[PDB]
Amino acid sequence: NFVCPPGQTFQTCASSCPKTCETRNKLVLCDKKCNQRCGCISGTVLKSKDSSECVHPSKC
């Protein structure tokens, strides 16, 4: 099995280079690689450098 934390969803293509309020540029965890793990909602960003809940750029 494989489950995220709150604010993040499973994605087939999502590198271990997570997006946060710092980035906000990608509408996926990251894009330089396709890792089949979890990753923020498509529109959010992992609050901080390594939080556990993804917020939108509009909130950030």
SS (H, E, C) the chain: CCCCCCCEEEECCCCCCCCECCCCCCCCCCCCCCCCEEEECCCCEECCCCCCCEECCCCC
Q: Six-digit token pair at 35?
A: 């890792």
The domain segmentation of the chain, as residue ranges, is: 1-60
Q: Are strands 54-55 and 45-46 parallel, antiparallel or unpaired?
A: antiparallel
Contact 22, 59 (CB under 8 A): no
CATH number of 1-60: 2.10.25.10
CB atoms under 10 Å from CB of 40, counted, come to 28
Alpha carbon dihedral 8, 12, 17, 19, in 10-degree steps, equals -40
Question: At residue 41, what is the residue type?
Answer: I
Contact 54, 47 (CB under 8 A): yes
Q: Six-digit token pair at 43?
A: 């529109």
Alpha carbon dihedral 16, 21, 7, 43, in 10-degree steps, equals -90
